[PDB]
C-alpha cells in the first residue's frame, strides 16, 4: 500500500482520479470519509489522498 495505493478512500476505481464533493463524487456523505481514513492511518478535491495524509504522521 503506497502513498497513492492506500488512501480506503462511492466511486469506480478508474473514475476515482487522484486529481471529493465536485468531480470525483466521493449532505453527510463526505463526513464519514474522514472518520474512515482517520481509523486506518491512526492519526476541496481528492488532493489530501497524498498532501495532508503523508507529511502529517
Amino acid at each position: 500500500s503506497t502513498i497513492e495505493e492506500r488512501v480506503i478512500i462511492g466511486v469506480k476505481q478508474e473514475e476515482v482520479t487522484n486529481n471529493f464533493v465536485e468531480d470525483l463524487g466521493a449532505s453527510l456523505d463526505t463526513v464519514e470519509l474522514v472518520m474512515a481514513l482517520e481509523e486506518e492511518f491512526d492519526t476541496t478535491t481528492v488532493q489530501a489522498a497524498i498532501d495532508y495524509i503523508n507529511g502529517h504522521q
Binding site: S27, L28, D29, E32
Partner: protein
C-alpha cells in the same frame, strides 16, 4: 411516581439501547413494580441483570409462538402476582429474507404467517391468557411503526403485520374496555442503536430523517419510555384504542426536502 401501585409485565427487553428497556426504565422510575419475560435460555443472564437493576426478581421464560408457553408463564407469574395491572408488548419478527428488497418478490406465505403470528397475534394471545388476572384500571400497550400506514421500502410484510397489530389494538380495546382494561399503541419514530449505527444506509437515513422531523431530531428511547409510562398510568384513563405517534412529528410532514 405516577405508576406507584402498578405491576407491569414487560416483554422483549434485551438491550439497554432499545425501546423496551427505555420503557421499563421509565416505568421503574415512576415507581412501578416490574416483571420481565425472555426468549431462549441463553438470555436469562442479561435480562436478569436488567431486571435486578430495575428492582425486580421476576424474570420468566416465554415463547409466544406457543400457546402452552404463554399459559405456563402466566401460571408462574401468578405465584408472585395473583392479579396485576397490564403489560407492554414489545415483540415483532419477520424471517429475515422478507425484509430484503421488492415486497412482492420477497414475501411468501410462510413469511406472512410468522410475521403476523409473532408481531400481531402474540399481542392478543397474551391478553387472552391473563384476562382475569387483570385489575380494573389496567392498561395494555404495544409498539408499532409508520410502516403500518404507509409503504416503506424493505419494511415489506412487517407493514401488514403492524397494520394487523394496530387493528388488534382497536378490537382489543373494544372487547376489554367493558371490564376496565385500556389497550393502546405507540407508533415510534426510528431510533439510533448500535445496529443502526452499523450501516451507511441506516446512518445516512437516520441523519436525513433528523433534518425533516419537525422537532429536528429522532425521538429517544427515553421519549418513548415516558409516553409509554403515561399510556399505562391512570393519567391516560381517557385514552383507549388509540395509536399515539411518537416520532417528533415526522409522519405529519411531507415534502420537507423529505
Amino acid at each position: 411516581g405516577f405508576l406507584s401501585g402498578k405491576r407491569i409485565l414487560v416483554t422483549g427487553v434485551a438491550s439497554k439501547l432499545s425501546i423496551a428497556y427505555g420503557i421499563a426504565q421509565a416505568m421503574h422510575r415512576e415507581g412501578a413494580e416490574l416483571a420481565f419475560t425472555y426468549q431462549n435460555d441463553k438470555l436469562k443472564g442479561r435480562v436478569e441483570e436488567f431486571a435486578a437493576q430495575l428492582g425486580s426478581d421476576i424474570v420468566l421464560q416465554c415463547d409466544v409462538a406457543e400457546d402452552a408457553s404463554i399459559d405456563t408463564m402466566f401460571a408462574e407469574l401468578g405465584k408472585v402476582w395473583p392479579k396485576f395491572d397490564g403489560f407492554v408488548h414489545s415483540i415483532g419478527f419477520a424471517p429475515g429474507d422478507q425484509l430484503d428488497g421488492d415486497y412482492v418478490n420477497a414475501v411468501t406465505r410462510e413469511g406472512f404467517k410468522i410475521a403476523h403470528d409473532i408481531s400481531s397475534y402474540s399481542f392478543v394471545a397474551m391478553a387472552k391468557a391473563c384476562r382475569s388476572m387483570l385489575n380494573p384500571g389496567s392498561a395494555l400497550l404495544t409498539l408499532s411503526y409508520l410502516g403500518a400506514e404507509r409503504a416503506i421500502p424493505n419494511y415489506n410484510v412487517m407493514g401488514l403485520a403492524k397494520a394487523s397489530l394496530e387493528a388488534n389494538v382497536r378490537y382489543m380495546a373494544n372487547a376489554m374496555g367493558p371490564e376496565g382494561v385500556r389497550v393502546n399503541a405507540i407508533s415510534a419514530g426510528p431510533i439510533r442503536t448500535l445496529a443502526a449505527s452499523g450501516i451507511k444506509d441506516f446512518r445516512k437515513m437516520l441523519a436525513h430523517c433528523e433534518a425533516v422531523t419537525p422537532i429536528r431530531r429522532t425521538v429517544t428511547i427515553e421519549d418513548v419510555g415516558n409516553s409509554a409510562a403515561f399510556l399505562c398510568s391512570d393519567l391516560s384513563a381517557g385514552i383507549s384504542g388509540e395509536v399515539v405517534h411518537v416520532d417528533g412529528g415526522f409522519s405529519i410532514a411531507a415534502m420537507n426536502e423529505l
